[PDB]
Write a protein that binds this ligand. Structure first.
Ligand code: AMP
Ligand code: AMP
Ligand code: MG
Ligand code: MG
Lengths: 18, 328, 328, 16
């Protein structure tokens, strides 16, 4: 189950900011 | 003692499951279908993130519903499914639970938006008339479908001024209208609660949204948000009084046999009505027009019965120009 | 039965105007100098927009202070001017009023940041050690300058992960420390209030910030924000008791002759302490370390006197690695 | 005039 990186419950990727 | 004067028996005629939302059974889609990218809003009952659909690669909004009665979720879910496709209606794209915690998130269509505080200033007399006419299609649609958005105000309307596109959002307070039902007055947002919620007239109707459209508009043309600035629900009515004047607050009260808690009576007091022109200042003068006033005036009445229907307002001389540009 | 155990005089020795902020006289700069671009946040007492400097073309944050005692602004402002330049301290670039509405705004330096909720998880054992060591330089500095930030919690610390840059922000609660002064306990934010604010020990000190750092850090390694989740002030203490155990809450109380309102006594009750390792789950195990635990443990004490100083903590075995990396 | 918020004018999105 390659899991890791998830808020509440969604995986999320990067600081894509602006 | 009230009943809707338009669209009252629609939920009557429709199949019970249409409005019997506790009866809904959420058909969850696939989370991993999305990835989260940036937070972007955080409401009382939810947290908003901009995310993405990994399959189609389209930007999307992920609303993560904070702790609340499951039935208060099946509501919005249902309401949203019911409206989906509606003109200017935010569009639910998929709904989702989470593996463990078990928290639901609504994944909406994305709107590029500019906070009204930053955007509105920027609009032109026509810009406004248009956006309101757009905002109106939303409300008339959804009312016609048995629903009351019970939360109308700027922050819940997304505008992509770039594409002159508009969406009405957050239906977490929208509810189904059933004739004669006694609803809850702890709705809308202070500034935009209509009189009826402020004097406890529980069997309210779509009319409520009209008053919020009222404040919202009033404040746009006058450049004075919030228009009515209560620090508290009691104060709100008060602040309303000092503009529509108490001689009407009373005629209203008697008509519906409503009784002000004394004290509220007190705080309110005697006040004459202040005519709309007394808000036309120099900067705002370009947006204020005999029509804008008639229209506003016909939105902001103590008597919800006497407010314009959505439909009726979509014909008001204010919108003639826009309406033209439409079927063109 | 308290007095600061570090930097207690930082204001005593200094010229009175250094800390006598009501005496401040704001020297307003040029509004016209900036333009607003997008709203970005909106706090209890303020509204934040990202703006821009038309002269130099640099991004900036415009914080428009909502209605509050002028003296509560001259504080922010003064504190801010006092800190300016301090390591990892947000930087006040200019303060502006407005020819018309007479409406102060604080125009800070811009930080590109990622909401903790989306950023933190992303971090590595090291990453954390680092940012807290960074966050530490901010607190030690400012404490050394006679100031208490009084409201430390993720949302008030900006991190430009792309540049491993960090800023501590919202000095709206920060206040000058004067030995023996009885301050106000309606500060910090629920979750991150220290015991002293929850049992009413008003002559608190910098120590308070240590406990916030305490929760903040505790939650980051254990991946459990908020660590102590009170629904209410009383509850908070309670939730703290169920982890540090009541046998300490008591020793504390007697030491400072403090008395629990009965009832709060009640709600708290008897509870044994839960040792830190009972929070090391599988998902968080990579961040938890015999050191992270010693360090956390030395931040989270009922007794503010026994918490680490900022300085002291900047030497804890946890940071050795990082502290290496500056020396090089 | 340059439309204005509280006190500052507002930058722009573009259109040419
Ligand atoms: N330098 C900055 N860069 C980016 N966002 C900021 C900055 N300063 C304040 N904000 C934000 O505005 C919010 C609260 O405003 P304030 O009450 O000034 O602390 C924070 O959580 C941030 O999202
Ligand atoms: N679909 C959406 N797209 C963009 N922003 C949204 C969406 N739904 C809610 N929000 C927002 O959440 C913030 C505050 O919520 P509200 O006051 O309901 O506008 C706004 O500044 C918007 O960023
Ligand atoms: Mg605050
Ligand atoms: Mg507080």
């Amino acid at each position: 189950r390659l899991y890791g990186f998830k808020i509440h419950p969604m995986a999320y990727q990067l600081q894509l900011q602006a | 003692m009230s009943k809707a004067r338009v669209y009252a028996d629609v939920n009557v005629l429709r199949p019970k499951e249409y409005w019997d939302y506790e009866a809904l059974t959420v058909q969850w889609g696939e989370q991993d279908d999305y990835e989260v990218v940036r937070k972007v809003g955080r409401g009382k009952y939810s947290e908003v993130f901009e995310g993405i659909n990994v399959n189609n690669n389209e930007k999307c909004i992920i609303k993560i519903l904070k702790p609340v009665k499951k039935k208060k979720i099946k509501r919005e879910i249902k309401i949203l499914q019911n409206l989906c496709g509606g003109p200017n209606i935010v569009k639910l794209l998929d709904i989702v639970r989470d593996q463990h915690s078990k928290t639901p998130s609504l994944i909406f269509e994305y709107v590029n938006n500019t906070d009204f505080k930053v955007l509105y200033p920027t609009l032109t007399d026509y810009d406004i008339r248009y956006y309101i006419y757009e905002l109106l299609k939303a409300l008339d649609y959804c009312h016609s479908q048995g629903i009351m958005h019970r939360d109308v105000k700027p922050h819940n309307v997304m505008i992509d001024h770039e594409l002159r596109k508009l969406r009405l959002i957050d239906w977490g307070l929208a509810e189904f209208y059933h004739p004669g039902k006694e609803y809850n007055v702890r709705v809308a947002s202070r500034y935009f609660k209509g009189p009826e919620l402020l004097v406890d007239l529980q069997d309210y109707d779509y009319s409520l949204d009209m008053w919020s459209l009222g404040c919202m508009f009033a404040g746009m043309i006058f450049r004075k948000e919030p228009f009515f600035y209560g620090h508290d629900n009691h104060d709100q009515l008060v602040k309303i009084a000092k503009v529509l004047g108490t001689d009407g607050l009373n005629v209203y009260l008697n008509k519906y046999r409503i009784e002000l808690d004394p004290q509220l009576e007190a705080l309110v007091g005697r006040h004459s009505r202040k005519p709309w022109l007394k808000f036309m200042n120099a900067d705002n003068q370009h947006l204020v027009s005999p029509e804008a006033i008639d229209f506003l005036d016909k939105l902001l009445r103590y008597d919800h019965q006497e407010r314009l229907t959505a439909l009726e307002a979509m014909t008001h001389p204010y919108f003639q120009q826009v309406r033209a540009a439409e079927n063109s």
